[PDB]
Amino acid sequence: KILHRLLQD
Amino acid sequence: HKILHRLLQD
Amino acid sequence: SLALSLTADQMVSALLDAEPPILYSEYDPFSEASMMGLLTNLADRELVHMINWAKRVPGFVDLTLHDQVHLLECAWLEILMIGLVWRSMEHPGKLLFAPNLLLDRNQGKCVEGMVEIFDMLLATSSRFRMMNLQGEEFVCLKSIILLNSGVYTFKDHIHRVLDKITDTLIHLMAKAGLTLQQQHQRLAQLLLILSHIRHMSNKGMEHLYSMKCKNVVPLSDLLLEMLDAHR
């Protein structure tokens, strides 16, 4: 999940 | 045309 | 336009008096074709009453016939849906499409893609109940939907009428004892739910389009013409 990853960083 | 036309007029 | 000369109380009384009746489904105590059949039959009969309700909404008659047609074509499913969630309030977890037709989300699975729309409808009804939405507020919200939803697809008269409805909403909240901060905070909360109602309507239209293409259930020429308006 690209969106989830970006939100995590 | 549209049935809606008729319904709105009466 | 006589609508602008109406006081707040006169605005409320007119809307309350214009309210369409609560129709029944057909008497016999569920597949996809049968459920959608009942809902479609029900929607078709309600459209007839909605049209006459709309002509009784202040400011609506002052519009050209073409503008009347456009507003109704754009908003009709939204208006049915907000009516549905309103009368489903006192039945948490269920949708009261009609007094003799009270459904839960398990029934939504009979048709496909229906469950998502059911859950949204149920959520919205729950939101109304926990806000203690009053009938006076409801009729204001429903008329706002009629005049607003298609207004940018055409205007000044409609926005004047929309303003008058805002003043009426505030008038009711000030009458219920709410403070100034409470008044505008509740006004925002109510109006934001209209965004979700719009979303539900759009998802609903696609589903009805899927149904028309499946050829599954029969739909009236009127219901079809209302549907084609979004095509």
Add this chain to the structure above:
Amino acid sequence: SLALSLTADQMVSALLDAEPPILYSEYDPTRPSEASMMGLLTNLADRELVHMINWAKRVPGFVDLTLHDQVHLLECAWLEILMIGLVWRSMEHPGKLLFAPNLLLDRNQMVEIFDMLLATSSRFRMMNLQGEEFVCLKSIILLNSGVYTEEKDHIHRVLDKITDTLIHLMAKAGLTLQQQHQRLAQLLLILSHIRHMSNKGMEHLYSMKCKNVVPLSDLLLEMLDAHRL
């Protein structure tokens, strides 16, 4: 929390400071293609999405939510947020949409959706929407659009906080109490049309995906599937 403590002005300052930059496209006036234009917008949106995500993190109260909820709110609102940003920067360009400083299109260059965006921008113009009001509206969209599909209650407190902010702004602008409530409704009713444009936009994007003439980025594709399941 930290958002429930902010003053109206601190709210506005926080939002103004968190604004994303205006990205450029890869448009070339010399080069000629109907499909290429959509490719331009698609590329633009994909790069904007990255900034939007880092903008959302700075929206007061947003980070207070779970990751699963943050993900949901953005999946639902991303096109709405892109679209309201578009209509905002297109305000002073009557009859045109300013997708980027170097990509300024009119309706002649999908037609229906462009017309709605134009009308929305035109609505903002006559209302004379303020930047302070824009940033409030944009954050309302993020928090509200997916709130209905504990953690939900906190979101409503933040929304109410943003309503107080809009009212505070209008009162400072010199509007009477009746004028404040009217303008507030006017702004919030516009979010219904933005919801509508987004919905129509998603369906068209899904059309482009199957058609396969225009290629979608991997993030937009994931964002797109989020509205189908």
